[PDB]
């Protein structure tokens, strides 16, 4: 579990009370925040088939999440938990891989700091 | 089809208005942020040329692939209800559909169109490719807060009788946007885009702002259309070595512009005549 734990701990994101979002958010429903409108068109080679490999193995989430999650952020004009959480996972693992050098890893909570 | 390749510099300005609002940015005009210079999407001018052709032509072979109730797959499926319903063998059915959509729709014949969508009508590149229009100088988007003495649905109606929804009207107090464009001959061969369709496009570029007026545009004009018509189907000269002939600068002592009379548009047709024409269609 140390790779799925790290997947669901890099993916941890804030939830209020009675948040309709699961504590650990399912990958298909998580990747469904990257998809056009429903999770089947998320690219079965750099995405659903590679996020899972980047999740099952604690590898670095592909840039195609920033790219896709950002695409949906400004395309759905909102950041669903699942795009915030998935971006938190990407950026946390980009930091941890030294792929995002200066930045420091995100936390669950709002960082009333972070200067970024 | 056309047998010359054209590279045109289309200087068009906005005097008091939103040339092309950025939906990403409220509706405030598109701007090259790190230089503040305004932007007007290529699709914006292609749209106003579409509006111009839809305005003037009013005839088949120059339709526009069109306005709001313009479900594009409806037009595309009209293509597949043609001489090529079955007789064109799905492989080249889409190619015959391209040839149709190019024949009927001047939008498609002139600009391209992604029509691979319904009863797939192929994928037209479009000989005419306007670029983005980056204003010569930073547009100083004014963002004129306005008022309305009326509201919308009686959910934003005031708890008193005083309904009002001030809202915002972004205007460029002046911006001389400069749109580089390319009439590529190789794709004119694909779409059948002819010198008649091209003269239609030049008229459209010159007159596309006299007709597409909004409370948003305020006043936009076509300050110049310098068309570099190459001798070859190929390019006689590199396109940007031409576009640098149309050097548009703010004049000598203007802190920032407020009219076309604040820009000097120096056209350098000195040596391009190597084999090649420059026709000042708009300016």
């Amino acid at each position: 579990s140390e790779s799925i734990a790290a997947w669901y701990d890099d993916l941890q994101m804030v939830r209020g009370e009675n948040s309709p979002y699961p504590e650990y958010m399912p990958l298909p429903r998580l990747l469904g925040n990257l998809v056009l409108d429903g999770k089947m068109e998320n690219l079965p080679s750099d995405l659903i088939a590679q996020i899972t490999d980047a999740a099952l193995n604690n590898r670095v989430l592909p840039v195609s999440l920033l790219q896709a999650a950002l695409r949906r952020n400004k395309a759905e004009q909102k950041i669903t938990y699942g795009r915030a959480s998935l971006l938190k996972a990407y950026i946390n693992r980009a930091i941890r891989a030294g792929r995002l050098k200066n930045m420091k890893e995100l936390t669950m909570g709002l960082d009333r700091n972070r200067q970024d | 089809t056309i047998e010359k390749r054209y590279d045109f510099v289309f200087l068009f300005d906005v005097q008091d208005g939103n040339p092309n609002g950025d939906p990403d940015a409220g509706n405030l005009p598109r701007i090259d942020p790190q230089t503040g210079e305004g932007l007007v999407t290529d699709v914006c001018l292609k749209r106003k040329v579409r509006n111009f052709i839809q305005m003037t032509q009013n005839d088949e072979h120059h339709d526009i692939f069109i306005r709001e109730k313009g479900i594009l797959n409806n037009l595309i499926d009209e293509a597949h209800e043609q001489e090529n319903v079955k007789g064109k063998e799905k492989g080249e059915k889409t190619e015959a559909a391209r040839q149709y959509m190019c024949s009927r729709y001047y939008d498609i014949r002139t600009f391209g169109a992604v029509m691979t969508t319904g009863k797939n009508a192929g994928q037209v590149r479009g000989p005419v490719q306007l670029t983005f229009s980056r204003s010569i100088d930073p547009i100083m988007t004014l963002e004129h807060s306005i008022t309305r003495m009326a509201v919308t649905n009686e959910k934003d109606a005031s708890e008193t009788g005083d309904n009002r929804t001030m809202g915002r009207k972004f205007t460029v107090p002046y911006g001389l946007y400069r749109c580089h464009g390319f009439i590529s001959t190789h794709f004119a061969k694909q779409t059948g885009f002819s010198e008649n369709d091209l003269e239609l496009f030049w008229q459209a570029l010159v007159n596309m702002f006299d007709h597409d007026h909004s409370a948003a545009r305020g006043q936009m004009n076509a300050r110049g259309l310098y068309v570099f018509e190459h001798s070859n189907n190929l390019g006689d000269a590199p396109a940007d070595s031409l576009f640098k002939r149309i050097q548009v600068v703010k004049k000598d002592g203007v802190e920032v512009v407020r009219s076309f009379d604040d820009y000097l548009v120096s056209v350098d047709d000195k040596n391009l005549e190597e084999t090649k024409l420059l026709r000042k269609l708009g300016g």
Binding site: - | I31, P33, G36, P138, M140, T141, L142, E143, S145, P173, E255, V256
Partner: protein, 124 residues
């Protein structure tokens, strides 16, 4: 989080507007439409439009300030800001567009941090 010596005309005008509204909101705290609510839209974009009128309007707020020394406190930092403002720019640059909001909220923080203005004044 306030670069008191930024010299970025947008940022110094934002700071100036922040102190202007601080004075207005200390002149009469019960205020329907502070200059943020009525002037900020152009103060952030067309500083010449308002900032002239904002300072027709300023000495009267300094008068209406109940604590007559608080008026000196705030006028002093208006001057501290305006040393960095050689001119109210006709139209704030887009960089400066954003830096005006930066200045408004930076200087507003500096004013609503407890001792900052009263301290920083006493080192002048």
């Amino acid at each position: 989080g306030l670069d008191r010596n930024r010299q970025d005309i947008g940022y110094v005008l934002g700071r100036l507007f922040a102190v202007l509204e601080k004075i207005q909101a200390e002149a009469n705290p019960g205020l329907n439409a502070t200059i943020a609510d009525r002037y900020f839209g152009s103060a952030s974009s067309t500083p010449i439009a308002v900032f002239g009128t904002l300072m027709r309007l300023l000495p009267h707020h300094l008068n209406k300030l109940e604590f007559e020394g608080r008026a000196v406190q705030l006028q002093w930092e208006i001057r501290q800001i305006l040393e960095h403002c050689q001119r109210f720019p006709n139209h704030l640059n887009l960089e400066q567009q954003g830096l005006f909001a930066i200045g408004y909220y930076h200087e507003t923080q500096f004013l609503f941090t407890k001792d900052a203005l009263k301290n920083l004044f006493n080192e002048a």
